[PDB]
Symmetry: C3
Subunit: 311 residues, 3 copies
Amino acid sequence: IFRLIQLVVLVYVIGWVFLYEKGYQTSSGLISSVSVKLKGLAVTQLPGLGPQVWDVADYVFPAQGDNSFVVMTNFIVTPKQTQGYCAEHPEGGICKEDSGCTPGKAKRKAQGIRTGKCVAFNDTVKTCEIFGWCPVEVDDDIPRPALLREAENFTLFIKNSISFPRFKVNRRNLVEEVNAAHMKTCLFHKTLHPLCPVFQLGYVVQESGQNFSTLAEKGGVVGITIDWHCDLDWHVRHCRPIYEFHGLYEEKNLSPGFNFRFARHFVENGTNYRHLFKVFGIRFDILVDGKAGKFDIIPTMTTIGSGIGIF
Amino acid sequence: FRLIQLVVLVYVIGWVFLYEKGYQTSSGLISSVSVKLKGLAVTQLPGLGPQVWDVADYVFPAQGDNSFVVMTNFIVTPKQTQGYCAEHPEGGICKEDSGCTPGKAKRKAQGIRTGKCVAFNDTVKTCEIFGWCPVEVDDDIPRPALLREAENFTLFIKNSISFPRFKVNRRNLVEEVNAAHMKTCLFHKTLHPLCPVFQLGYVVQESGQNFSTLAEKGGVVGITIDWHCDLDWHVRHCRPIYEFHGLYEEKNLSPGFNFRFARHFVENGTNYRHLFKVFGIRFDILVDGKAGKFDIIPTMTTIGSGIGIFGVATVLCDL
Amino acid sequence: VGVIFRLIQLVVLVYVIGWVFLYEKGYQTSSGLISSVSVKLKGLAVTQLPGLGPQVWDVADYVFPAQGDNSFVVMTNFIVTPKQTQGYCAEHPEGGICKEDSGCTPGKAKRKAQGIRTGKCVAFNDTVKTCEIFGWCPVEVDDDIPRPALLREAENFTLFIKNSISFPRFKVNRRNLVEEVNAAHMKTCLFHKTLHPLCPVFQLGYVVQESGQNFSTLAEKGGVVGITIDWHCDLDWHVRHCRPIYEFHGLYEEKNLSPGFNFRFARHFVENGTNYRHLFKVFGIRFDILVDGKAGKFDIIPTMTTIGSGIGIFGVATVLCDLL
Ligand SMILES: CC(C)CCC[C@@H](C)[C@H]1CC[C@H]2[C@@H]3CC=C4C[C@@H](O)CC[C@]4(C)[C@H]3CC[C@]12C
Ligand SMILES: CC(C)CCC[C@@H](C)[C@H]1CC[C@H]2[C@@H]3CC=C4C[C@@H](O)CC[C@]4(C)[C@H]3CC[C@]12C
Ligand SMILES: CC(C)CCC[C@@H](C)[C@H]1CC[C@H]2[C@@H]3CC=C4C[C@@H](O)CC[C@]4(C)[C@H]3CC[C@]12C
């Protein structure tokens, strides 16, 4: 009758609501601690006087190794910068006489305070004098060898530690079920080697949907997410992380890039100088998330009440 | 009782159903924030030549993470080397050179002590230490702030987000206009809410803090970007909301934000350093939002919950 | 029979609903928070090395993030390779030992990335043959951890933590520094899990100690120590009862965390128009600070939902009564 028909629907409806979509499991949070170490040397040299060597202490800009590192792939350097009077970059002034520019800092993009003098910048152009980091103004042009292109083969290591807030279950990225592979020499693969934490930069960039040849010329942002999905309805094992290299690029306005400017201030015979670097590098962002969940009497009671209650 | 309970039950269940969006499955987000600052601060000190500070100098760190510090004032102690010199007067004052507990002091540590004390000629006489000499004297904070031009500096926040389990990603920098109009906008809480370029003076002011007192001693300003949108409507309606918080309601005056960093250099084989006491404004940018799309399972759960509540009304009415 | 069954069902309904309400605390509308924590370190570490001159380390030296972050390094040991010239040197024997002339031509080798070779071989130690590479060339980094930590005096350093939080949903904000601001006892406290539970956590040695990590082992080569701040206060009570709870974690199980934390760090300088470098192998203790909590408020909509949430006991109380 009506009662018999409603009884069958109740179990089937509650089966998907509570017997399938958890509810009998107490979901908890997580506390993560990810430390990243790189392994690579980029000796590409320059078309000038002598080669150059870039070790891990040079291209990984957060030295302490934050979860968001800015590993360098290209740069342009203006060496021996000192505060003085010289010719302004033509981006601001193209004067032909002393009346072209007025003394004082410009109301718009300026490189320093002007004393006021239309001096020679060479390059068959004339500009007005300024005071600032002015042995020569920085000239911006992205090189096209992709200077630190050897970073494509650079190696990451994203060992992560999970502790959970109250379940007192400690798990980490290095499962070590095979004892560090017993010969090391593993590279991560979304199909072949999904448990190897030694992702390569080229693979990381490629699996994000971007092109490294474009990300080694200008900058780029790559997101890596580690997701923990502990169930604790089984042995303490079988809980492993899942890495997703996100992209963030999609379509957008092509590839905007990512560059930042940093300086190396040094000192000489009485005066202070500066090595100005315009750095184009790929920024890797690491975000760890977890779900967890363990059996408890209270969630089961709440489900057995609401399940009957929903009737 | 059936007529009265049915009218009431439908109303209360509908309130839980419609207003609370019980049929909607919310989801998290993953975001990346990149900040670009433009502006030059000229702090020509009286009695000497000018000194400019470009973005490579007053931004800590240079990479510009979510929590970055913009220098607004500083005290510099140049040419510091490890050697024998007198203590700062706030460590103790000699009357005779009968030691000052040679070795590291138990309370005020600035270098190991030698037991013989010389004249620190601020009318006082401290005791010799081995450490970074000369000793920093940061009693007088430069007032007004040296980098007063930081008020007009513009902060450009470029936040790009993506909603997991929905395959939708959006950027706070809205793609609706081109240059000469997107490169002219300045943010305003009412006039230009969608403009992503913020001015430091406006950001500090909108947090309830005075920039004049927040530049000399520093401060902490929090910027929150909130992505509160639903996927039921068109994705063009998903827009960010910017709110600036004066963290800890700036107490009453607050000590401000300050830190010490050094520039180490070598002169004739000797290691020196430039000690800086940086008074800057720390900006914290945290992005969080919730979004969802209609699905069959949340609707079924809401229907089951509402139908059960109607049955509870009949049971209560039966009493 | 029916009346008694209905009375029993009502009694058990009331009992379970009351127990759930006293347990679930669902009538409170919990919300997130906005966190802001700033750390101040106070301590001087003096180092003694073979020579006539000691060395001191200011806070601007062993705190590597400098400007301060949630995660920071408080380095307690280091190895320094000074005056790196970036020229032609002898590669480290770890990369490879040559014989006669096995330079194998430049090309940065296959597994030993130490500059680019040159096809010539000359060395420094009793292994007098190790190939000639082009790179930072005072000497290759011969790193051995000093058994007594150089900055072992960091166990007495102070870690003044100033946490500012806010609840935007209910427009309430609190600070790590508890009520009765300033007044007496100026800078005369020290955090203890039982004796002094309300004062910013200090004494790095004690912070490492309250994680089962044996700072003496952590000073030489140790690594990450986690600090968690949980507020967990209900705003229905007085707002002065909302206080932080500090918990220190280890995030370790003694499997591969024994090497701890280390990172390279370089100081570049110029002498006679030549770029040089001071390479540091820095062994430090990383401190991570994580803050979270839920406030909750009485309101009316959560009360209505909990009344609806209480329909679980009242849903099939009569429906299941006739079944049995
Ligand atoms: C016990 C009843 C009343 C509670 C609800 C039962 C359902 C939801 C749950 C509770 C305990 C669960 C079991 C717990 C442990 C395991 C071990 C695993 O190798 C297979 C699944 C299995 C066998 C689970 C199957 C589903 C299960 C039976
Ligand atoms: C009659 C049944 C199916 C109603 C069940 C409630 C749900 C499915 C209804 C209630 C309100 C509805 C929404 C109301 C308004 C809009 C905005 C419009 O631009 C697209 C459709 C959309 C997004 C509707 C989708 C369907 C919707 C979410
Ligand atoms: C309205 C009744 C019948 C049903 C709901 C009960 C609610 C309103 C009751 C149950 C428990 C109560 C709380 C119990 C204890 C305290 C601590 C006291 O220092 C302030 C009031 C406060 C915070 C009460 C506020 C009101 C409260 C939340």
